[PDB]
Write an enzyme that holds these catalytic residues in place. Structure first.
Site, PDB file in Angstrom:
ATOM      1  N   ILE A   1      -5.407 -16.499   0.592  1.00  0.00           N
ATOM      2  CA  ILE A   1      -3.984 -16.366   0.297  1.00  0.00           C
ATOM      3  C   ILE A   1      -3.258 -17.554   0.935  1.00  0.00           C
ATOM      4  CG2 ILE A   1      -1.926 -14.901   0.770  1.00  0.00           C
ATOM      5  CD1 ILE A   1      -3.722 -12.457   0.246  1.00  0.00           C
TER       6      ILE A   1
ATOM      7  N   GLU B   1     -10.739  -9.431  -0.027  1.00  0.00           N
ATOM      8  CA  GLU B   1     -12.051  -8.929   0.456  1.00  0.00           C
ATOM      9  C   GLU B   1     -12.694  -7.877  -0.448  1.00  0.00           C
ATOM     10  OE1 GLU B   1     -13.383 -10.642   2.525  1.00  0.00           O
ATOM     11  OE2 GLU B   1     -12.091 -11.176   4.202  1.00  0.00           O
TER      12      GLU B   1
ATOM     13  N   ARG C   1     -14.389  -9.758  -3.171  1.00  0.00           N
ATOM     14  CA  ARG C   1     -15.629 -10.438  -2.774  1.00  0.00           C
ATOM     15  C   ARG C   1     -16.794  -9.457  -2.673  1.00  0.00           C
ATOM     16  NH1 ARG C   1     -11.979 -13.153   1.654  1.00  0.00           N
ATOM     17  NH2 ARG C   1     -11.732 -15.326   0.966  1.00  0.00           N
TER      18      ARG C   1
END
Ligand SMILES: *[C@@H]1O[C@H](CO)[C@@H](O[C@@H]2O[C@H](CO)[C@@H](O)[C@H](O)[C@H]2NC(C)=O)[C@H](O)[C@H]1NC(C)=O
Lengths: 6, 246
Positions: free
Chosen positions: B71, B160, B163
């Site tokens: 970000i 996250e 991912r």
């Protein structure tokens, strides 16, 4: 791969 | 762009958002069937804009570097906010051009600096969809200390979870109740860079890692990943950071 909470 | 509304959000619409975010990220190839992010992208094409809406329908737009899913900054009304880092300042000359004012946050976007600014390690900050709603609300009224904590929740519930499938599922379990992240969740976040590199250089080496990665599993049990055959590789990791950026 695994899961729940913590 | 990608969008997510908390009004009427359930585990399924969150799942659709995480899926939208994943294939909004460009890649040329796959390594062991996992999308490999680009080494670089030039201009305004390097950034993805996420529109997030809290329960009340207020909004923030978050800019995400597509080469690493970091970000860079966010827009809240007519003010843009960018991390105090060279990457985010490069980003500022491409996104949120029409903001009336630009504020630079007094920290960079890495977990260690964000935790110091927050006064709490992310072990002790509950996450979930309710937390995300709170995080969005906190971010549209500048307060640097609260913003650090809100950003720790935002990073984990978006970047996250994109991912790792495991983390996406953690957040789906916390659809209507926040809970601190498990140890596994934290070691995964901490190992993305390491795992990405070992998966990439396993490919001329019969699927065997040059150096084993040490993780923690669900039961809080320490585990050693040595090859692409592990569940982490086949059924968890969803994006690989290119070794050029490691
Ligand atoms: C890939 O990872 C698996 C899982 O960690 C490895 O599994 C071990 O295999 C050896 C020899 O086959 C056994 O002695 C161990 O008991 C296995 N461990 C477990 C936890 O079952 C596997 O060896 C790795 N593959 C390669 C090529 O090294």
């Amino acid at each position: 791969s695994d899961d729940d909470m913590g | 762009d990608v969008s997510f509304r908390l009004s009427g959000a359930d585990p399924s619409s969150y799942g659709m958002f995480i899926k939208d975010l994943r294939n909004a990220l460009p890649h040329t190839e796959k390594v062991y069937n996992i999308p490999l992010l680009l080494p670089s992208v030039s201009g305004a094409g390097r950034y993805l804009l996420m529109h997030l809406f809290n329960y009340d329908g207020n909004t923030i737009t978050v800019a995400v570097d597509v080469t690493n899913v970091y970000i860079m900054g966010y827009l809240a009304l007519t003010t843009s906010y960018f991390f105090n880092e060279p990457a985010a300042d490069l980003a500022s000359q491409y996104v949120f051009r029409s903001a009336r004012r630009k504020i630079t946050l007094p920290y960079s976007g890495n977990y260690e600096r964000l935790q110091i600014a927050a006064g709490k390690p992310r072990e002790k900050i509950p996450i979930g969809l309710p937390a995300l709603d709170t995080a969005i609300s906190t971010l549209l009224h500048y307060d640097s200390t609260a913003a650090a904590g809100a950003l720790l929740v935002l990073i984990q519930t978006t970047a996250e979870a994109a991912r790792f499938k495991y983390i996406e599922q953690q957040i789906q379990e916390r659809a209507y109740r926040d809970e601190v992240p498990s140890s596994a969740t934290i070691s995964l976040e901490n190992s993305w860079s390491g795992l990405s590199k070992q998966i990439q250089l396993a490919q001329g080496n019969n699927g065997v890692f040059r150096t084993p990665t040490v993780l923690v599993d669900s039961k809080g049990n320490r585990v050693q990943i040595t090859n692409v055959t592990s569940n982490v590789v086949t059924s968890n990791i969803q994006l690989l950071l290119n070794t050029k950026n490691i």
